[PDB]
Every structure is written in structure tokens, then in C-alpha cells.
């Protein structure tokens, strides 16, 4: 008996990229997928055979809405400055009590009355959100509503706050006053969201809270099962990588004859933006002995690229990741997921938000290196691939983690769950 299943995102490329994901494994299953979402991102959810909504079609004209995605370099070259010249702690001291993702909360609220209308009409059965935090809508709607976390989910547990890339190394002293920073932020989170919720008259709830069902996508391998179980509600996806067409990604002429490995390096869809970022890295590889894959981004064709690089805006990750000996990545959670699942260790540059747990997590699980910005120099970023690529230990620890990922069957118990959740409304 088909059910009609209902998607929704923010902006992120990343956040949509993991429901595509969940979408397929329903839709195999003769599920109707539906997903509310943006234009740019009309042809990929086509493509996959999910019905698309453009959420643009149902905005109140006193609320309007917008793809922030080609507006996000304001916000992304803030975060560099700050991230290239501030230590983490730094940062969180000079952040006063601002939360990462405040100001997103305000101007939720176009996203809010169009998912009400949305849910109204298309009349659907169950819904999924992948959402930074919880959205009034989610608690109004006549169907039960699955957050979907694609973030590293070390904020489901208690221990090391979220956001900050505290290490399980760190000794007592250094994370104590980071934590105190982050106590505080996240109460300005939490006041920030009861004006929203206030808004549309819902009881505040916690920012991820999980009313009955939450699915969050993460390798079990690099989960933390250290800091105990997850929140209530919580169940873990292994990986949710969308299918790609392409399945030989063919290598440039401009890189065949030319010494060493080959080296894939990207800073996401978001921070990839910030032009400054991006020089800053590829300037010292000129000189690296290897040959290098760039997803130049957004702002990619004034970007410039040397003799042992190629490039383009947008490049086919899952299809390239197999032909590559390392990735140089900003520690986004699908890039991260994508590259172990392919085998490949990991040299991270954290951006911001959850990348920085996501850094420090591959640095202590011997799956690659963290290298920040602000201790960044072309010397240090020549050796750590030098380091990786030898680094015998690494190497097999990244390919067990990859066959676990392979061979996962984790979707088996999620998909029974929201199938359960759909028809009988409870668990
Ligand atoms: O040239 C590119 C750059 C990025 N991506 C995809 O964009 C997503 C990036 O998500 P991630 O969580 O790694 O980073 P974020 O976008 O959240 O910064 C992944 O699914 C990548 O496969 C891609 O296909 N080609
Ligand atoms: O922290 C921020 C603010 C802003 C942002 C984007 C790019 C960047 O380089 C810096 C900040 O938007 C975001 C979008 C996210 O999905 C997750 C985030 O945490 C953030």
C-alpha cells in the first residue's frame, strides 16, 4: 500500500543531498516521494522521480522567501576572517553569546507558513525535515514529522558541547572554558527559537528533539558510542549517498604524464564560495608532487589553478572519489561519508559549524589529519599530505571503516520505522 511521503531542507545542497538518499530507499519500496525545496535543486529531485514543490509557490506575501545559497558569500567571508585569525577558543569568546546559526532563526518563518500550506494540500502521510533546528510547522501538521540530522551528531548525546571540535584528548582545563561559552550560545539559541515558536502559537520544544522518530546519517564506525546512546527518538542511518549517473569519471588530459598520486580538494558547496579560501590552499600545492582534482566553486572561474591541477565548479564527488589516494575536504558530514565509504583518508580544513567535531573526529579515529586555518601555512599542508599518503596506519583504517560502510544494514530497521510511523501514526 503506497504512502505519500514528503520531503523538506534548508538551502544546503548537503541537507538535500541526505534525503535524496532516505527518498531512493523509499521509493523502491513503491512509496509516492515528494519534495518541497528550492528551483535550482528542481532538476536532481526530478531526476530521482520524487514529485517536486517548489516552496517559493506557497510563501504569505507579508513572510517572503528566499534560496540564500547565491547570497551566501557575505556570511561565508565573515566566517573566514574570523576562522583564519581566531584560535576556536577565540572565536567562541569573541562571538559574545551569538550562536552559529542565530540569525537563520528570525527569517525562518517564510519556511514556516509555506510548509503549513504545503502539508495541508498535498495531504501527506508522513513528512521528513533535514533542518539545522526544530520548526513550528513540525508540531501543527496533521502527520507525524521526522527530523533528519545530516550534522554531526555529537550534540544528540551529553558531552562535548557541539560546534566547538573538542578532542578526546584534550585535557580537563582546556575544554572546561570552552564549554561554558557554548552552555551560554545555546541558551541564546534557545530564546531566539521561542520568539519563533511564540510566532505561531506551538509550545517550544527543544531545538532537536525527536516527538517519536529522528533519523541521523553518520558512520557507525566514527559514532559515538563513547559518550553512551543518542537522545530518545534517535535512530542512526550508517551513510545516505544518492545514486550517481556518471560511474567512470574520466580524468583530464592535462593530468595524464604528470608525476605522484591523485588528490581530490574541496571546500563544499557553502564556504567554497569565499575565493580567498580556496587561493589560499592551492597556492602551496602548485608545488606538491601530485596531481589534484578542484571543485572550484560558485566564484570558481577567477580562481587561479597550475600546471599539476584541473578544476570546475562543480564536480561529480561520488563518481571521482574512487579514482583518488587522498581528499582534502572541509569536513562537511555527506563529503566526509562519501570519502570513507570510497576508502580514502582525509586531510580536513574546518569552515564552520559542525565541521569542526567532524575534523576532530577523523584526527582521533587515525582516519586522516585536522589542519586549521588559523595554524595554516603551505608548509604544514605540503607535509600533511606527504603524511597521509604514507601513513600505513591510516590507510587500513580508513578501508575498515569503508567495508563497513559497504555492507551496512542499518536502512533495513529505519525504513521499517518510518513505514510503521506513517501507517499507524505511532511507533
Ligand atoms: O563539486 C562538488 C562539491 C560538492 N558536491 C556535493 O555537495 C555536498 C557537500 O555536502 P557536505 O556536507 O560535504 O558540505 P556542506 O555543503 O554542508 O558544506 C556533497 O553531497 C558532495 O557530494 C558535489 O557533488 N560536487
Ligand atoms: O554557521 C552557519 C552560518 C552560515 C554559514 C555558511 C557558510 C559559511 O562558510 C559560514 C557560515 O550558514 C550556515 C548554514 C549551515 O547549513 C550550517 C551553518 O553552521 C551555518
Known amino acids: 500500500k503506497s504512502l505519500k511521503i514528503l520531503f523538506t531542507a534548508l538551502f544546503g545542497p548537503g541537507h538535500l543531498n541526505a534525503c535524496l538518499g532516505i527518498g531512493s530507499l523509499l521509493r523502491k519500496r513503491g512509496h509516492q516521494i515528494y519534495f518541497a525545496h528550492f ?78 500550506k504545503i502539508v495541508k494540500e498535498y495531504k501527506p502521510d508522513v513528512c521528513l525535515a533535514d533542518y539545522l533546528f526544530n520548526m513550528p510547522w513540525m508540531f501543527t501538521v496533521d502527520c507525524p514529522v521526522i527530523p533528519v540530522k545530516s550534522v554531526n551528531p555529537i550534540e544528540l548525546y551529553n558531552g562535548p558541547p557541539a560546534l566547538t571540535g573538542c578532542s578526546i584528548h584534550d585535557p580537563p582545563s582546556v575544554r572546561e572554558e570552552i564549554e561554558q561559552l557554548a552552555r551560554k550560545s545555546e541558551l541564546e539559541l534557545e530564546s531566539e527559537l521561542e520568539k519563533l515558536f511564540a510566532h505561531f502559537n506551538v509550545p517550544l520544544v527543544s531545538y532537536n528533539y525527536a516527538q517519536q522518530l529522528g533519523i541521523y546519517i553518520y558512520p557507525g564506525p566514527l559514532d559515538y558510542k563513547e559518550l553512551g546512546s543518542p537522545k530518545e527518538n534517535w535512530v542512526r542511518l550508517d551513510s545516505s549517498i544518492r ?18 598520486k591523485l588528490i581530490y ?133 580508513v578501508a575498515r571503516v569503508s567495508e563497513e560502510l559497504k555492507k551496512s544494514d542499518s536502512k533495513d530497521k529505519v525504513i521499517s520505522l518510518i513505514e510503521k510511523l506513517a501507517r499507524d501514526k505511532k511507533l
Open 243 to 260: 545514486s550517481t549517473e556518471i560511474s567512470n569519471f574520466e580524468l583530464p588530459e592535462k593530468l595524464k604524464d604528470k608525476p605522484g
Open 39 to 116: 528551483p535550482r535543486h528542481r532538476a536532481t529531485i526530478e531526476k530521482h522521480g520524487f514529485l517536486f514543490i517548489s516552496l517559493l509557490d506557497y510563501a504569505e506575501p507579508e513572510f517572503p522567501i528566499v534560496d540564500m545559497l547565491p547570497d551566501i558569500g557575505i556570511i561565508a567571508k565573515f566566517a573566514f576572517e574570523r576562522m583564519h585569525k581566531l584560535t576556536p577558543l577565540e572565536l567562541f569568546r569573541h562571538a559574545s553569546g551569538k550562536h552559529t546559526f542565530a540569525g537563520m532563526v528570525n527569517g525562518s518563518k517564510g519556511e514556516n507558513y509555506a510548509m503549513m
Open 265 to 397: 580538494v574541496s571546500m563544499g558547496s557553502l564556504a567554497s564560495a569565499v575565493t580567498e579560501l580556496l587561493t589560499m590552499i592551492l597556492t602551496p600545492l602548485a608545488n606538491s608532487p601530485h596531481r589534484f582534482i578542484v571543485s572550484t566553486g560558485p566564484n570558481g572561474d577567477s580562481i587561479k589553478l597550475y600546471d599539476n591541477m584541473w578544476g570546475d565548479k562543480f564536480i561529480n564527488q561520488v563518481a571521482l572519489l574512487p579514482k583518488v589516494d587522498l581528499f582534502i575536504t572541509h569536513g562537511g558530514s555527506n563529503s566526509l561519508i562519501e570519502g570513507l565509504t570510497a576508502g580514502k583518508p582525509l586531510i580536513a580544513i574546518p569552515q564552520f559549524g559542525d565541521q569542526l567535531d567532524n575534523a576532530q573526529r577523523i584526527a582521533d579515529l587515525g582516519l586522516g589529519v585536522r589542519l586549521n586555518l588559523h595554524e595554516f601555512s603551505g608548509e604544514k599542508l605540503l607535509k600533511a599530505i606527504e603524511d597521509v599518503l604514507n601513513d600505513e596506519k591510516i590507510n587500513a583504517n
